[PDB]
Amino acid sequence: AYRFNGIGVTQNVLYENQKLIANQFNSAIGKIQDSLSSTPSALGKLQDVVNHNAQALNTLVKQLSSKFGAISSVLNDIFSRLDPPEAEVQIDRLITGRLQSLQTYVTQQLIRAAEIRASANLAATKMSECVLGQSKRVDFCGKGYHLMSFPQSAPHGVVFLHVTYVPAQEKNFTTAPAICHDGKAHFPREGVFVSNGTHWFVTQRNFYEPQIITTDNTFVSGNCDVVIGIVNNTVYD
Amino acid sequence: QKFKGLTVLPPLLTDEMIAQYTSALLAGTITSGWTFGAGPALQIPFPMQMAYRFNGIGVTQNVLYENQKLIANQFNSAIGKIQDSLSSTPSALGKLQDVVNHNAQALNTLVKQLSSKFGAISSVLNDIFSRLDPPEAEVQIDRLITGRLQSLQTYVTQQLIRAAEIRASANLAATKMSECVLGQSKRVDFCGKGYHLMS
Amino acid sequence: ESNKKFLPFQQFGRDIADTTDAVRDPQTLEILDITPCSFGGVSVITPGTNTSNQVAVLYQGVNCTEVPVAIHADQLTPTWRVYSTGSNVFQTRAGCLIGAEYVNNSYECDIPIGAGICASYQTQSQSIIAYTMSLGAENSVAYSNNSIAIPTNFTISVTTEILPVSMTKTSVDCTMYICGDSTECSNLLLQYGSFCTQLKRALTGIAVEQDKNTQEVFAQVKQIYKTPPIKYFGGFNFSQILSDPSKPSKRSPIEDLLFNKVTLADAGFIKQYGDCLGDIAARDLICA
Amino acid sequence: LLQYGSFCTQLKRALTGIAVEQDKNTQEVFAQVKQIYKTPPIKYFGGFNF
Amino acid sequence: ESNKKFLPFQQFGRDIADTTDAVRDPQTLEILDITPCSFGGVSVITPGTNTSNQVAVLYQGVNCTEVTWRVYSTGSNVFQTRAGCLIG
Numbered sequence: 092a093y094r095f096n097g098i099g100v101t102q103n104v105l106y107e108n109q110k111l112i113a114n115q116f117n118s119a120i121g122k123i124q125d126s127l128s129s130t131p132s133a134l135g136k137l138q139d140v141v142n143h144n145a146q147a148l149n150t151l152v153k154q155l156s157s158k159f160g161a162i163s164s165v166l167n168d169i170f171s172r173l174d175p176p177e178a179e180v181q182i183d184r185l186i187t188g189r190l191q192s193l194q195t196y197v198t199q200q201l202i203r204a205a206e207i208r209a210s211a212n213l214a215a216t217k218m219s220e221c222v223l224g225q226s227k228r229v230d231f232c233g234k235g236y237h238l239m240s241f242p243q244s245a246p247h248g249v250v251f252l253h254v255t256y257v258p259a260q261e262k263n264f265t266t267a268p269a270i271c272h273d274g275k276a277h278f279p280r281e282g283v284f285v286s287n288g289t290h291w292f293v294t295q296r297n298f299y300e301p302q303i304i305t306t307d308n309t310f311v312s313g314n315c316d317v318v319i320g321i322v323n324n325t326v327y328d
Numbered sequence: 329q330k331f332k333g334l335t336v337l338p339p340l341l342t343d344e345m346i347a348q349y350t351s352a353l354l355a356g357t358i359t360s361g362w363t364f365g366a367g368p369a370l371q372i373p374f375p376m377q378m379a380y381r382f383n384g385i386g387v388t389q390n391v392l393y394e395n396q397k398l399i400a401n402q403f404n405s406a407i408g409k410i411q412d413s414l415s416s417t418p419s420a421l422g423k424l425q426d427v428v429n430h431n432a433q434a435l436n437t438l439v440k441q442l443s444s445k446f447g448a449i450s451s452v453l454n455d456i457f458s459r460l461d462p463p464e465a466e467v468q469i470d471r472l473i474t475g476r477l478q479s480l481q482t483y484v485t486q487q488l489i490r491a492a493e494i495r496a497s498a499n500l501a502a503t504k505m506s507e508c509v510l511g512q513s514k515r516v517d518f519c520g521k522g523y524h525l526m527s
Numbered sequence: 528e529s530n531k532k533f534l535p536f537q538q539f540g541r542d543i544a545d546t547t548d549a550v551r552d553p554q555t556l557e558i559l560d561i562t563p564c565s566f567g568g569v570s571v572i573t574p575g576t577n578t579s580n581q582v583a584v585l586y587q588g589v590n591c592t593e594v595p596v597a598i599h600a601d602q603l604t605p606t607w608r609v610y611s612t613g614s615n616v617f618q619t620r621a622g623c624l625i626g627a628e629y630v631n632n633s634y635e636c637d638i639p640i641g642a643g644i645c646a647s648y649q650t651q652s653q654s655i656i657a658y659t660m661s662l663g664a665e666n667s668v669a670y671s672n673n674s675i676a677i678p679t680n681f682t683i684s685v686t687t688e689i690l691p692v693s694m695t696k697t698s699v700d701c702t703m704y705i706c707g708d709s710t711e712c713s714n715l716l717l718q719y720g721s722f723c724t725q726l727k728r729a730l731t732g733i734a735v736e737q738d739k740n741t742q743e744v745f746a747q748v749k750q751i752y753k754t755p756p757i758k759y760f761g762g763f764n765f766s767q768i769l770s771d772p773s774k775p776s777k778r779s780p781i782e783d784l785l786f787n788k789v790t791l792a793d794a795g796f797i798k799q800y801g802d803c804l805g806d807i808a809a810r811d812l813i814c815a
Numbered sequence: 816l817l818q819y820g821s822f823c824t825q826l827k828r829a830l831t832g833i834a835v836e837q838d839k840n841t842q843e844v845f846a847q848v849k850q851i852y853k854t855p856p857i858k859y860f861g862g863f864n865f
Numbered sequence: 866e867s868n869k870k871f872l873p874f875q876q877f878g879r880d881i882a883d884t885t886d887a888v889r890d891p892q893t894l895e896i897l898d899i900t901p902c903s904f905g906g907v908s909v910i911t912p913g914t915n916t917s918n919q920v921a922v923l924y925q926g927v928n929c930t931e932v933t934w935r936v937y938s939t940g941s942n943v944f945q946t947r948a949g950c951l952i953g
């Protein structure tokens with residue numbers, strides 16, 4: 092009820108649709124659990140994280156078979172078949188090539204580590220705001236009006252289960268920005284003036300709930316001759 | 329450049345497609361407020377949406393409902409003056425100009441590096457092979473090959489670093505698109521200098 | 528033939544890269560050009576070999592009527608000459624595409640090709656089709672200055688987000704990697720400075736940073752709260768996310784599903800050397 | 816040059832990665848919504864001038 | 866001892882890194898394997914020298930049932946970890 096009050100929905104909505112909301116949440120949880128198994132390529136991010144390290148180590152191992160311009164890739168053969176004056180000339184090439192390979196590996200690892208650190212900082216921020224509270228940022232903590240989130244552990248990462256609120260089943264109405272009564276304008280405190288074609292009602296924003304117009308939910312603030320589109324009707328006491 | 333093995337590939341999304349995306353975003357904003365970013369788009373008149381946004385920043389609806397004409401004129405004047413300012417000041421698009429210039433100069437340096445000697449006797453492989461025999465021709469060939477490989481490695485490393493920076497900027501731009509355009513932000517100095525209304 | 532006018536008795540001509548571009552014939556005083564023979568990139572568009580063995584070829588930066596003289600045709604194998612002019616040729620800004628049939632429809636993009644052009648494997652007789660990618664379904668909401676829309680029903684939805692946190696911590700040994708069993712190589716390598724110290728410092732920094740990342744993500748709270756013995760939360764149950772004692776490591780069913788889905792190819796951490804030497808026939812990558 | 820191994824292929828792999836990343840950046844920035852709305856034929860919005 | 870099936874015309878084996886793995890004895894034509902003898906890293910665990918001079922040694926990735934200074938012997942202070950074997 093607090094979390095619906097957060098996004099602009101009164102408590103009575105949940106207090107009257109508790110069972111429906113619970114059933115919907117249960118069905119969604121079951122559906123996502125089945126969908127994770129059904130979809131083969133879901134965890135591509137983590138799979139790529141593993142594959143990058145595997146491929147880099149394999150390339151580093153494979154690089155040992157190069158000659159880099161010398162006569163052989165085995166140091167013992169050079170030592171056995173050449174005198175030191177030429178052995179040094181042949182060996183420095185191999186040493187330099189292997190040093191270059193190691194340097195390239197280290198630089199690539201540094202760049203990838205920076206990227207992973209950025210991702211980890213984003214994950215920590217999402218854990219702080221999505222899970223330990225209710226977020227107001229748009230498209231942060233899921234698509235829609237945020238309700239809550241849950242963390243789950245994964246190899247080399249984390250998975251978030253965002254729970255959001257989505258409207259549905261819209262309907263057209265006729266609206267007016269103010270209401271004239273006894274020569275006084277009337278604006279709604281919280282709501283929008285809507286008409287069903289005969290009678291005018293004040294309803295909340297994101298859930299159709301018509302209410303009678305009364306002094307309690309309106310304030311006067313001026314005169315009817317300034318506003319554009321104002322409509323005159325009677326307000327009860 | 330293409331005669332030396334360096335090519336430029338075209339982007340997947342064309343300018344027409346990007347313009348269509350931008351026009352769709354603008355139309356959705358104008359005709360529905362922020363509802364199209366949270367669910368199905370719901371119609372609402374523009375003065376009422378602006379009243380919603382004054383209510384958001386902390387000003388009652390009557391202020392706009394009584395100063396509608398003045399606010400509209402002020403908005404029109406500002407949006408008109410933006411074009412004049414952009415046309416006048418010839419230093420506004422500095423970031424994008426630098427983005428173009430960096431790539432241009434990097435490619436130019438990579439191309440021009442092909443004329444270096446790297447301690448060899450010449451920068452022409454054909455001349456080296458024509459004037460020397462293998463036992464010491466291979467030394468010069470190795471020198472040239474190592475130098476050119478070093479040049480390629482330097483180019484690739486700089487490109488990787490610049491790509492990381494551009495990715496950070498693009499992530500920030502995506503966040504601004506999500507929060508400043510599809511809603512109204514409460515962060516200070518994130519959208520604009522003052523109480524944010526639109527984008 | 529060259530139309531560049533030349534100051535007389537001037538022979539050579541260079542380009543931006545300072546290479547020979549125009550030459551003067553010694554016998555007849557005529558100026559020629561040394562533009563390289565035609566060339567360009569070749570890209571192969573294929574679905575998985577698990578499905579079919581049909582491919583399409585893209586020629587970057589080449590107009591479709593110049594391909595046979597650009598790829599040096601009429602000498603390659605007849606299999607390669609099929610992917611020459613032949614039939615079903617389309618022209619894009621990226622270059623000439625041969626082997627795919629253009630289609631007037633528009634779907635989502637499957638295999639990116641060039642500027643707004645994609646490709647896919649369609650049933651139409653399976654074939655390869657190239658089209659223009661679709662931006663999405665057309666829509667138009669009706670704007671009015673006295674009309675509003677208000678929802679009358681809601682929906683609870685649950686999505687999924689995946690983020691990497693840490694990578695694998697490794698370590699390298701210069702002497703073992705470069706010299707191996709030799710000792711004279713080590714004696715020679717002792718004269719190359721502190722490259723090994725630098726690499727060790729970098730790898731150690733990365734290794735510590737990974738653990739720091741994990742701690743920052745997960746060690747938010749410091750009190751280990753316990754789940755109440757009974758599970759009733761007004762009709763919601765959370766059995767799919769709470770711990771299951773029977774399952775290994777007291778993990779949730781969803782966590783077990785994730786751990787089974789991700790194929791961690793590095794078992795490791797089993798201090799394996801005796802079994803590493805024992806089973807040579809395995810050719811284990813970790814042992815290698 | 817054939818005697819240098821994958822040191823001539825690592826650069827190609829990295830460049831391809833960057834090239835794919837650029838398109839990913841553009842897609843994430845601009846493809847926020849997948850419904851192509853159309854602007855009303857009449858362009859009167861309370862006195863605002865678009 | 867080896868069980869590789871060398872063909873009669875083959876006399877050497879190679880790994881991914883093109884290093885000799887198997888060999889055939891010239892006098893007695895049998896097949897043998899070559900593996901380097903064990904090695905591994907060493908780490909020292911100490912408080913600050915301002916506090917004490919006692920240290921501990923960790924042998925990374927080594928099962929210490931088969932474990933230039935040999936002063937740090939067992940001493941009934943041998944413990945087994947996943948990252949190695951702690952001594953001291």
Ligand SMILES: *[C@@H]1O[C@H](CO)[C@@H](O[C@@H]2O[C@H](CO)[C@@H](O)[C@H](O)[C@H]2NC(C)=O)[C@H](O)[C@H]1NC(C)=O
Binds near residue numbers: 114679680681
């Ligand atoms: C709001 O949506 C829910 C979800 O569809 C509706 O509940 C369903 O109503 C139908 C019709 O009575 C039943 O057959 C279903 O069993 C209900 N549950 C589900 C999960 O579908 C609810 O009726 C809607 N509210 C209104 C006012 O239309």
Ligand SMILES: *[C@@H]1O[C@H](CO)[C@@H](O[C@@H]2O[C@H](CO)[C@@H](O)[C@H](O)[C@H]2NC(C)=O)[C@H](O)[C@H]1NC(C)=O
Binds near residue numbers: 117121764766
């Ligand atoms: C929690 O909700 C789920 C949703 O179905 C239930 O999980 C299964 O429910 C079926 C229905 O009878 C049982 O047959 C299964 O044994 C349940 N578990 C599994 C793994 O399928 C679960 O029963 C619900 N919890 C409670 C206390 O009712």
Ligand SMILES: *[C@@H]1O[C@H](CO)[C@@H](O)[C@H](O)[C@H]1NC(C)=O
Binds near residue numbers: 262263669
């Ligand atoms: C509102 O009116 C328009 C008129 O064109 C209609 O297209 C739209 O669907 C209506 N909304 C409904 C019926 O929910």
Ligand SMILES: *[C@@H]1O[C@H](CO)[C@@H](O)[C@H](O)[C@H]1NC(C)=O
Binds near residue numbers: 287288289290
């Ligand atoms: C509109 O609401 C009024 C309530 O005063 C009711 O009398 C009338 O029947 C309603 N009309 C429609 C079309 O719902």
Ligand SMILES: *[C@@H]1O[C@H](CO)[C@@H](O)[C@H](O)[C@H]1NC(C)=O
Binds near residue numbers: 322
């Ligand atoms: C509102 O009242 C005025 C006079 O009090 C009258 O002229 C006007 O017609 C009324 N509004 C409507 C919509 O009839």
Ligand SMILES: *[C@@H]1O[C@H](CO)[C@@H](O)[C@H](O)[C@H]1NC(C)=O
Binds near residue numbers: 554555
């Ligand atoms: C080159 O010499 C030949 C004689 O072999 C002669 O026929 C030809 O005309 C000469 N060309 C000149 C002088 O340009």
Ligand SMILES: *[C@@H]1O[C@H](CO)[C@@H](O)[C@H](O)[C@H]1NC(C)=O
Binds near residue numbers: 590591592593
């Ligand atoms: C056809 O090829 C020629 C060869 O250079 C090129 O100049 C021309 O622009 C090409 N035509 C089209 C329409 O691209």
Ligand SMILES: *[C@@H]1O[C@H](CO)[C@@H](O)[C@H](O)[C@H]1NC(C)=O
Binds near residue numbers: 857
């Ligand atoms: C409202 O919309 C209609 C139709 O687009 C237009 O004719 C009219 O001028 C607008 N304004 C008012 C106050 O009716």
Ligand SMILES: *[C@@H]1O[C@H](CO)[C@@H](O)[C@H](O)[C@H]1NC(C)=O
Binds near residue numbers: 408864865
């Ligand atoms: C504002 O809209 C009017 C249409 O009434 C148009 O004539 C005018 O050019 C627009 N403003 C600007 C600055 O173009």
Ligand SMILES: *[C@@H]1O[C@H](CO)[C@@H](O)[C@H](O)[C@H]1NC(C)=O
Binds near residue numbers: 892893
């Ligand atoms: C090789 O010579 C030794 C003695 O020198 C002998 O014992 C052995 O049988 C010989 N092996 C072969 C294969 O001839």
Ligand SMILES: *[C@@H]1O[C@H](CO)[C@@H](O)[C@H](O)[C@H]1NC(C)=O
Binds near residue numbers: 797798928929930
């Ligand atoms: C260490 O070696 C002993 C004896 O070979 C063995 O019983 C024990 O399981 C080993 N520890 C491991 C493999 O962790």
